[PDB]
Structures are given as C-alpha cells and as structure tokens.
C-alpha cells in the first residue's frame, strides 16, 4: 500500500510533510532553472584579454552546466517517482503534466548525446529554446495556470475559429495591401507573404511602423484592416474570459463545499 501512499503525497502535497517539502523543493528548482536559463545569455563583461564581452553561460560554462545537471536530476527523480507511484502508469504517461515533464527533461539528455553537435547551430538553439518549457512545470504549483489550461481546452472551437478567421483576414488584407503598395518606391511590400507581417501588426493594433502604406489605397485598406482585426480578435475574448471565471467559480464552490 506504499504505492498509493506515495501517489497521495504527490497528488496532495499539503497532506503530508514529506509531500510538502518535495513540493517546495521542486518549485524552488524550477524557478532556479528558469532564472539560470535567462541569465546565461546576459553579457558578463569582457574577460581578461577577451576581445568582446562573453555571455555568463559561456564564461562560466562549467557552473551553468552543473546547475542545469542538478535541476535536471531533480526533475528526473521526481518524474521517475511519479511514474513508479502511478496507479495506471500508462494513463499517467499520456497525461499533460507527464508530457510537460518529459519535454522539460529531454533536451538535457539529447544535448548529452549530441555533445559533438553542441557547437553546431540549429539543434543547439532548438534545445536551448525547449529548455524554457520547464516553466510549465509551475502548473503543478499554480491553480490559475491549471484553470487557464482547462478554459483553453473548453474554448477549443472558438480558438479554432479565431485561428481560421484570422488566417482568412490576414490573407485577404495582405493580398490587397501587396497589390496597393508593390509599386511604391523602395516598397517593403515585396510579396503577399511579406505583407502578412504588416497585416498582422495592423490587425492587433501593434503598429510597429516598420511597414507602413504610402499610397491612398494602402491607407484605406490598412485602416479597414485594423478595424477588422479588432473585430476578429474580439470575437473569442468574452468567451475565454467568461469560461475562466466560470471554472474559477466552480473550483471555489467545490472548495467551500468540501471545507
């Protein structure tokens, strides 16, 4: 019956002292890993005799590797314990938290296997980027994060229509903008895919200004694009906000009922 005891500790950290210390230790090392991954890219100043300033992760590669190894070992022991204490192991493995944990730990081991290709870009940059998904292990510590996941899953059809109608509007407005603006002098609107960038920046009302229309037709269709983007993006926002509040309120009804 020790397996179910360990599982109960893992699922309910606040029931047991050992569960709670495990909870806090893992949360602390998630924060440590995230901060280290950010900090290792910061220029640490020019080293003695160095041509240029070196990133902290390059100047202290051993220290950052040791910190990464400690965090990854903690995450791996955590995941292996969760797998060991799972009632239905396959059901655990296919759960979203398990996918998050596996995505968090895999890049370290892949980078070990591909240590010869560490200098080679492409894969190195991909592993570096995938290291940032360890921040999703905070979903086990944040109830709001889990509720956000539940509401995104709940609003799947509205998010799908958001993607589809946004794609439609982007294509339409980029076509019109490209044909209105391609003849301008030194035009940034060099193709319809190039005009995708302008269209998405206009629809969200970012307005970077790196791409701006210069013709009258360009101005007219850019204005219409901004308004249409406002409408398209506003369509699913009330649904998402309402479902988030509904799930939060259901959680707090359950909490006050059982306590």
């Amino acid at each position: 019956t020790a397996r179910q005891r360990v599982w109960r500790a893992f699922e309910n950290p606040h029931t047991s002292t050992m569960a709670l210390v495990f909870y806090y230790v893992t949360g602390f090392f998630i924060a440590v890993s995230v901060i280290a991954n950010v900090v290792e890219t910061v220029p640490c100043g020019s080293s003695p005799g160095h041509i240029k300033e070196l990133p902290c992760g390059e100047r202290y590669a051993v220290a950052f590797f040791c910190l990464d190894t400690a965090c990854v070992m903690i995450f791996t022991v955590e995941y292996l314990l969760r797998l060991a204490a799972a009632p239905s192991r396959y059901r655990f493995v296919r759960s979203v938290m398990s996918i998050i944990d596996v995505v968090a730990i895999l890049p370290y081991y892949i980078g070990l296997v591909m240590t010869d290709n560490e200098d080679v870009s492409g894969a190195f940059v991909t592993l570096r980027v995938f290291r940032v998904f360890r921040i999703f292990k905070f979903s086990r510590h944040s109830q709001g994060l889990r509720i956000l996941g539940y509401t995104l899953k709940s609003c799947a059809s509205e998010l799908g229509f958001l993607l589809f109608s946004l794609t439609m509007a982007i294509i339409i407005f980029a076509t019109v903008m490209f044909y209105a603006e391609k003849g301008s002098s030194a035009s940034k609107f060099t193709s319809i895919p190039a005009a995708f960038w302008y269209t998405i920046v206009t629809m969200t009302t970012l307005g970077y200004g790196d791409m701006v229309p210069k013709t009258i037709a360009g101005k007219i269709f850019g204005s219409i694009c901004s308004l249409s983007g406002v409408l398209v993006i506003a369509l699913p926002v009330p649904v998402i906000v309402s479902n988030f509040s509904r799930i939060y309120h259901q959680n707090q009804r359950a909490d006050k009922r059982r306590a």
Binding site: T17, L20, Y24, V25, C66, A70, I74
Partner: peptide
Amino acid sequence: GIAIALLVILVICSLIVTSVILL
C-alpha cells in the same frame, strides 16, 4: 514543511557549489 524544504534546498545548493568548485 517549509523548514525541512529550506534545509534540503540549502544542502543541494551546497552540493552544487562544491561540484562547481571541484570542476
């Protein structure tokens, strides 16, 4: 619960530091 977690955190941090100093 907080105290034991803090103690474990300090132990593991010390081990990381000693590993760094060794290498």
